Design a protein around this ligand. Structure first.
Ligand code: CL
Ligand code: MG
Ligand code: MG
Ligand code: MG
Ligand code: MG
Ligand code: NA
Lengths: 242, 242
């Protein structure tokens, strides 16, 4: 219990958007013997129960849903944080208002709804709306590649809100992610600083620079290990802890 | 000379957002020996299936999801319509653009997410955002009762879009409904015009002004009866159809 194996949820412990296989769930309780285990993902405590199980807080020594902004230690809640509590209501409104007014001046073939999805760890801004069909989603992506609308919107966002502690990125085919600096998976690491672990082994699939693991994989405080699929994840752990 | 009994769903055939009972499911099919039956509700066809059954189109002579904009008759799809097809993407965006700019200017205590929900038959525009917590809804509704934010907005919309054949009604505590004229429950009546039904009885539970049944209930093409629950719906039909 001097080590911690910090696993990522999708592409690592389960199949993307899927329920963990009973076998994998077995190996994680087998490894729990030699090291403390934990899960982190940009998924709320519910999706973590749909995929890992309602007893997720009991099957791990650390549960870090929403990249740790919501956190648990030893089955007992540790703390909770939100972008409204960090940035303040005023700045939250100044960002929303800028994005709303910006999206209103973009000429598209189609606009729909849910242009601003509010989450406790991030705002998901889409010029078309996250309620668009799949055909309409593609239409925007293809046109985005040629016209570079999302890229221009990211640039204006970084200039408007310069030195406000925010990170803007292009996310997927139609959206733009907004979150305070360091609120990626690396936020879960602040709940482990004073626990003093010799090594925190992190495990994830998006180690690519531009992925949702890169920052925690490249972070000094972790020994990153890239995994292609849950079968790979259990392999590496078999050697590290024989 | 046939007759038709048109039923609202939530609060009239089923309990709110719940599954129909078998006594009501068997009552309606017993009743089909005396008159044709149909169901109309705001929900999409998928929620109608969940609550009334998977064989819904085989059990009701008429199924009118989304207030009839999707219509089914005798188990075969009649026709489908949507706001973007009646108004056009041109105007859909003119509406969405105005509401976004407007909302970006409303000074509120808090703003969150889902400021515009796109549905096939309407747009739900909320200054605060329809993804806010209870305690947030109430905070806004209280302020709304004191500064009339939604009413000022409704009045500005009616002027900006007068002549485009739209209707701006206040809904719930935080939202403003936007739909083409006639696109309430009365819309389904068009599919029953040339049927020649001697009498079209209607049953609903929110028949007062503001309820989603008031328009179809007061429409002269219908003989309306107000119900309190599926048990009352039964009672009235036993009298009308001995
Ligand atoms: Cl929105
Ligand atoms: Mg992943
Ligand atoms: Mg590292
Ligand atoms: Mg109803
Ligand atoms: Mg009437
Ligand atoms: Na009236």
């Amino acid at each position: 219990m001097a080590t911690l194996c910090l696993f990522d949820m999708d592409g690592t412990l389960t199949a993307p958007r899927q329920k963990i296989t009973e076998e994998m769930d077995g190996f994680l309780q087998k490894l729990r013997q030699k090291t403390k285990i934990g899960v982190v993902g940009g998924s709320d405590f519910e999706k973590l129960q749909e995929q890992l199980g309602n007893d997720v807080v009991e099957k791990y020594d650390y549960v870090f849903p929403e990249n740790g902004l919501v956190a648990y230690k030893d089955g007992k809640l540790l703390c909770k944080q939100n972008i409204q509590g960090h940035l303040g209501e005023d700045v939250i409104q100044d960002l929303i208002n800028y994005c709303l007014s910006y999206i209103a001046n973009i000429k598209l073939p189609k606009k729909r709804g849910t242009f601003i999805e509010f989450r406790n760890g991030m705002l998901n801004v889409s010029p078309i709306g996250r309620s668009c069909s799949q055909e309409e989603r593609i239409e925007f992506y293809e046109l985005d590649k040629k016209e570079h609308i999302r890229q221009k919107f990211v640039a204006d966002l970084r200039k408007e809100f310069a030195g406000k502690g925010l990170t803007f990125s292009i996310g997927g085919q139609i959206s733009i992610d907004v979150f305070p600096e360091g609120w990626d998976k690396r936020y879960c690491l602040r709940h482990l600083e004073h626990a003093g672990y010799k090594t925190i082994y992190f495990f994830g699939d998006k180690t690519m620079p531009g992925g949702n693991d890169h920052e925690i994989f490249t972070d000094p405080r972790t020994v990153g290990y890239t995994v292609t699929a849950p079968e790979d994840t259990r392999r590496i752990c078999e050697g590290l802890f024989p």
